[PDB]
Amino acid sequence: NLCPFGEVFNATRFASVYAWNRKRISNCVADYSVLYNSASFSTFKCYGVSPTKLNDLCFTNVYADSFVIRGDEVRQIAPGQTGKIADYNYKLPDDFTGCVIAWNSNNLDSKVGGNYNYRYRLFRKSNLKPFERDISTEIYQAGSKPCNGVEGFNCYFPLQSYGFQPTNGVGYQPYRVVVLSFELLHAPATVCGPK
Amino acid sequence: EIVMTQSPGTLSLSPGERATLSCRASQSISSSYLAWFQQKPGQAPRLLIYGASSRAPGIPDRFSGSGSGTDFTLTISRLEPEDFAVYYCQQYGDSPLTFGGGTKVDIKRTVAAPSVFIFPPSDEQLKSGTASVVCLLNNFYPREAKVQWKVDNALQSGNSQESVTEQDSKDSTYSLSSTLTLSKADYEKHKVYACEVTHQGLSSPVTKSFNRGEC
Amino acid sequence: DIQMTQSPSTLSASVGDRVTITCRASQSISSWLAWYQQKPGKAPKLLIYKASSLESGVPSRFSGSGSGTEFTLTITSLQPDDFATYYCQQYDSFSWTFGQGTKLEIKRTVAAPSVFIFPPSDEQLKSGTASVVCLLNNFYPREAKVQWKVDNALQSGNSQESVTEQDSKDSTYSLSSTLTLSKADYEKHKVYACEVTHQGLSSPVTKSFNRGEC
Amino acid sequence: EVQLVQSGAEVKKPGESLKISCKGSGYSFTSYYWIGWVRQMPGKGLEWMGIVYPDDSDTRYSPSFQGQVTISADKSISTAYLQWSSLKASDTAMYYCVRHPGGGDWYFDLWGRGTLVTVSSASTKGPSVFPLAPSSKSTSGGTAALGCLVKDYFPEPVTVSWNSGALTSGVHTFPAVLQSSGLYSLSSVVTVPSSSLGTQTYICNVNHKPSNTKVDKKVEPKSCDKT
Amino acid sequence: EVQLQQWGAGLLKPSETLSLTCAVYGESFSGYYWSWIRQSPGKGLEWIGQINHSGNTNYNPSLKSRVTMSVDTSKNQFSLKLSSVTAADTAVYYCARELGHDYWGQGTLVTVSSASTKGPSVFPLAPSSKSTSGGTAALGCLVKDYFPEPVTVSWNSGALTSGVHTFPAVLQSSGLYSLSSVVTVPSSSLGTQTYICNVNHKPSNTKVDKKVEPKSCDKT
């Protein structure tokens, strides 16, 4: 069947880390050989499994979460972490089973002048729960007055844009990230490797 | 960590005149998220300008903001006694917050001739097991003035510590005090001790000195 | 490959009138679509991106509309500098595909297609082959056919036609067919006839000449 | 001014290889922009070929052209290159170099004037001039036509003027159509009053630059000598 | 008008632990983040972190490893613990509200050092025949090798408030402090009026009342 690991990795446009795109994969023959053997993926980590023995398992469902972030905020994509991305935008659990992949995309996501289309959530009155989204654009009240959906003093907008230019540094450059989460339940296994 | 840099590190004006301070970031900032803080001695910082152009409540109409991207500027129409303080630029568009170094604002007046004085040690400190000579410059503007020590017509370094006073509330002048400390052995083998001074208010450096056992 | 379909393809109009063109995608391209203008000989020019945005250096009569699967381009105050070809391009996904083209014309009265016939010269025969020609000077609209009859008998695959562009004065086309043959096949028969058919013409006129007769 | 300059036209033959260039001037041209190529067949639409990033020398092609052509770049002199190994007759077309304002804005904001590529089996040749003196049925209310015909010439283009460039009364030079012998044919014609049996001595001036050929040929109402 | 009250340790020693506590009055403790901000000389202001009522923390990567924040909701209190304090952590710490644009604390100075309490050595600098410029000569006293701050100096027990210039405390290599207090007076009084430099160190309650006399060149 060779399910679509190309519409996820090889796509022209990606999402913003506060609106990360999730795709469900089911009833497939999954080839994890292109990934484990490829000089493109700068970051390739795997938690709960060994990356050389992936074609030997059989899960029930797979979830592919895709987004774009800075180059220095990739260490925040892991269990038991802290930061602006791991508390307000995208949070992984602690009993995590899957694999994190990340690669540079300065040629597609950058632009002379600046690409201000990728955004992050900067302000939140609490911390996200694992695998939770928050697309609300309500106004952040940090003072004594109510904001009434109107910006002003100590009433700020929580979604703020990255600044991506080609002449930036490797730490302020864009990186595209795909998180694969395997789900093995009491039901049969519909995602097995090839033979 | 967005690095903010203020310009200039110091500034000297007089009442009435207008003031212009600047802040510059390392990478472009979010929409215009750039605040200006004021700080006086003893007190805590006070916010004046938010959003790089908006004026917070209870602030006089003479503080104005401008700029965007990587360059921002604060303007003060007419300086007042309460306006001489230390200013800071802050960015809250990313995480973590980052303040700027600072930019002081000192009063300006006419140059003044530093009154130079020297002091010899006391036998108490001598028998105590050390010696230290003192040079005092008084009532001089501006602050930038150089001082050095010469033991028996021989420059020194690393063995002298200087301190400066604060702008008086009356005449806008400064005082400097340099202490040259050393073991009594170096004081009994070196002969002379000379305080040399160079200030913009003078035409040529001036040296005041005294020799061993002189008084 | 997202396939783009334009409509119409040949759309006549006048000066000062309002014109509309449509592009259509096989999928959903939210707002990723640009419009290019191309005149004969010159390179294409950008007019609109994002499907509702204008380029710096463009007039206001050009406007774009749409989102999803159908887009439109409208030109209100048409002027001579707008008669050209227009292409829609999508830039949502690779590969990037254009449309097919939507030309513009300059309508006019239904002209009166004339017709001329010119035989060959014996110098062409000395060269080894002869060629007759038939012209339809100053005709409109463009649809006009010329049939060649060698002895009142259709003869295809032997001639070649060529049609001009729109004249700048009367906006009329001009066509010319040339029937080339050998010094042997030229002796095949004698009556070479050119028959002009044109919707604007009420009766197809015919003009024929025998070998060595004119 | 911000612009892109392309190499001149090209005439070639099958089998041979080819390389054409585009250079950008007026911006950070040395790098940081995708340079691509767009094809246009004679009297047809536009087809996209590929793009290249000069800095990292990345490349993206279209399926219809993957393998056939090569698209490369050079950041030092800021020049992009399109390359063929074995040419065919189908590669006869106009080619434009284009620039992306990247970062999600993947439209073409800059175009070149276009490089014309002709792929022929034949070789250079001079034109053959023939007359198109008026006809008998051409006595259409006085509307008499005359002309000249330029046939069996290669490569393009030629130019056909009249009276050393003094007559433009309803005079047309039809396009050049391609025969099967790898040659070209066209005709120029003028309309006048049928009273022009002796009013004008029209001379067609045909000029072909590649072959350095020039021919001035007169027109005369053909007189069928009576026996 | 939110009011914030700080307290905590002052002097410490290397590799010890610093603990501070700020309390709130006049508004809801919940619904906001509460931040800590330190200011040092030469290194300007700096942001440490912020804590919520639910116990959720934002930290600065520079200090992520050493900082521990705590919150007591019942008392409306939050607290900071910074470990492995070196001599570079000497600074003034403030407690503030989220994005301190609105309200701040009053400040808590924290000093690190290896030495302990100690009293000052007072030595007089006397008006010599060389240091007189226009019938007005300068004298003074010099405090050396004291710890900690502040040691306050007066003259004739507040009987003089003119020409008084007291310089700050310069840190020496011995981890101690030193300063000098000079005063200018007319040479027409150095033999008539009494000149004393009353020094008082509070952290040790050590007081001195030393009189000053000229530096004559006794001819043997």
Residue numbers in the entry:
A (entry chain A): 316 to 510
B (entry chain C): 1 to 215
C (entry chain E): 1 to 214
D (entry chain D): 1 to 227
E (entry chain B): 1 to 220
Article sentences:
To gain insight of the structural basis for their broad-spectrum properties and the neutralizing mechanism of BA7208/7125, we determined the complex structure of a stabilized pre-fusion trimeric Delta Spike with BA7125-Fab and BA7208-Fab using cryo-EM. The resolution of the RBD/Fab interface was improved to 2.98 Å by focusing refinement on one RBD/Fab sub-complex. We have identified four hydrogen bonds, one salt bridge, and one cation-π interaction formed between resides from the BA7208-Fab and Delta-RBD. Residue K444 on RBD and D105 on 7208-Fab formed a salt bridge, while a cation from positively charged residue R346 interacted with an aromatic ring from residue W32 on the BA7208-Fab to form a cation-π interaction. The BA7125-Fab bound an area at the thumb region of the RBD. At binding site of BA7125-Fab, eight hydrogen bonds and two salt bridges were formed with Delta RBD.
Cryo-electron microscopy structure of these broad-spectrum antibodies in complex with trimeric Delta and Omicron spike indicated that the contact residues are highly conserved and had minimal interactions with mutational residues in RBD of current variants.
